[PDB]
């Protein structure tokens, strides 16, 4: 009587129904859930996420060491939501945000709501309040670690900060879903106390890390970042992405067009030279990057070709 694949589907179907779509998936499943998303600023990362970017109405955790490119991503996400006419909020407990750098990544800072809370409790209560107004497309909490309990801030023993995150996250997920607001928790590393509850509440968790220092030989242009989607409840998890961030600049589009253009074969890399349908792009990723910077026409058709092959 037993037919495994049949019984499996019935079980999987029941699992998703009792706990929500994506509670169980095959890693090679070709997801066809066009949920609304906020492009990550990185084409490869959006692909890695399987849905085109960060899902709307969900909790996102972006962790990693400092100088990994975490906030750059958070910032491109804000910029993209704003471009789509969305409103953005920034709960700041770090006081590190460089709005001039943000404007460079396309963020409309003048319209950016910023809040510099007195305590972790207040910081999350302010975020909850903004969220359940339903007016926001996205909200970024700078530093899970900086969300220190009031009691600690006023000189008091216990494990309070984690319960703080658990309780706040419990109340907030409901609002996020109804409002459709995406919440990005930036988690500078060294679990950061509240990172514990975040691990379970998140629909997406990004392991961000610095892996290289861009050269072009003998000086530095910027650094390369690698992101792994360790958790993904909307599309198969564990996929990875890489991209370049040049000093003072954000995520290099041209850089991403070159990388993906190579793996997906539209761009041919014969040794140290890059070529695109006949014409040469240059010797060394940088010259090619510079090339795509000037010959905007090319870049767009490549982007076009890469986009068509996987989804504009
Ligand atoms: N103000 C800036 N000017 C020029 N480059 C910057 C600036 N801020 C960040 N960068 C670049 C350097 C890194 O490759 C990428 C990492 O910084 P960022 O995205 O803020 O990472 P991060 O969030 O993991 O570390 P941090 O906690 O220092 O912000 O951004
Ligand atoms: Cl993007
Ligand atoms: Cl205070």
């Amino acid at each position: 009587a037993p037919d495994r694949e049949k019984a499996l589907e019935l079980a999987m179907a029941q699992i998703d129904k009792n706990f929500g779509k994506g509670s169980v998936m095959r890693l090679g499943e070709e997801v066809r859930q066009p949920i609304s998303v906020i492009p990550t600023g990185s084409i490869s990362l959006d692909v890695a996420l399987g849905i085109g970017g960060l899902p709307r109405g969900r909790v996102i955790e972006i962790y990693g060491p400092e100088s990994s490119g975490k906030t750059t991503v958070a910032l491109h996400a804000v910029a993209n939501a704003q471009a789509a006419g969305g409103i953005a909020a920034f709960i700041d407990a770090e006081h590190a945000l460089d709005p001039e750098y943000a404007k460079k990544l396309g963020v409309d800072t003048d319209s950016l709501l910023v809040s510099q809370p007195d305590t972790g409790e207040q910081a999350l209560e302010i975020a909850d309040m903004l969220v359940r107004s339903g007016a926001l497309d996205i909200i970024v909490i700078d530093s899970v670690a900086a969300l220190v309990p009031r009691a600690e801030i006023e000189g008091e023993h216990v494990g309070l900060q984690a319960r703080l995150m658990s309780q706040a996250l419990r109340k907030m997920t409901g609002a996020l879903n109804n409002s459709g607001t995406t919440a990005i928790f930036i988690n500078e590393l060294r679990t950061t106390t509240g990172g514990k509850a975040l691990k379970f509440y998140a629909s997406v968790r990004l392991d961000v890390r610095r892996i290289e220092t861009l050269k072009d030989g003998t000086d530095a242009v910027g650094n390369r970042t690698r992101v792994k989607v360790v958790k993904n409840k909307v599309s198969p998890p564990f996929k990875q992405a890489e991209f370049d961030i040049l000093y003072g600049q954000g995520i290099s589009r041209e850089g991403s067009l070159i990388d993906m253009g190579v793996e997906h074969g539209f761009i041919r890399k014969s040794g140290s030279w890059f070529t695109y349908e006949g014409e040469q792009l240059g010797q060394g990723k940088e010259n090619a990057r510079k090339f795509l910077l000037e010959n905007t026409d090319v870049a767009n058709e490549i982007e076009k070709k890469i986009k068509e092959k996987l989804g504009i």
Side-chain angles (χ1 to χ4, degrees), residues 1-20 22-31 33-34 36-60:
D3 167 33
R4 293 186 292 172
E5 277 311 321
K6 186 60 204 68
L8 194 51
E9 314 285 25
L10 195 171
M12 287 177 70
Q14 187 60 59
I15 288 169
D16 265 35
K17 181 174 64 178
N18 290 306
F19 312 113
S23 287
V24 60
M25 314 182 253
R26 291 187 177 76
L27 292 179
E29 193 64 64
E30 302 280 316
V31 167
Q33 316 297 70
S36 301
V37 300
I38 300 180
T40 187
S42 166
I43 313 176
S44 53
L45 177 54
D46 295 310
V47 175
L49 284 164
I51 61 176
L54 301 185
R56 283 284 288 286
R58 300 286 179 283
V59 173
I60 293 66

Side-chain angles (χ1 to χ4, degrees), residues 242-268 271-274:
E242 292 191 16
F243 52 81
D244 309 306
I245 300 175
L246 301 184
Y247 303 128
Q249 295 178 54
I251 296 183
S252 177
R253 167 162 170 276
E254 292 63 36
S256 269
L257 292 177
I258 292 182
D259 297 313
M260 307 213 99
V262 170
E263 65 180 63
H264 293 57
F266 306 77
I267 295 179
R268 204 69 71 68
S272 61
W273 281 78
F274 301 78

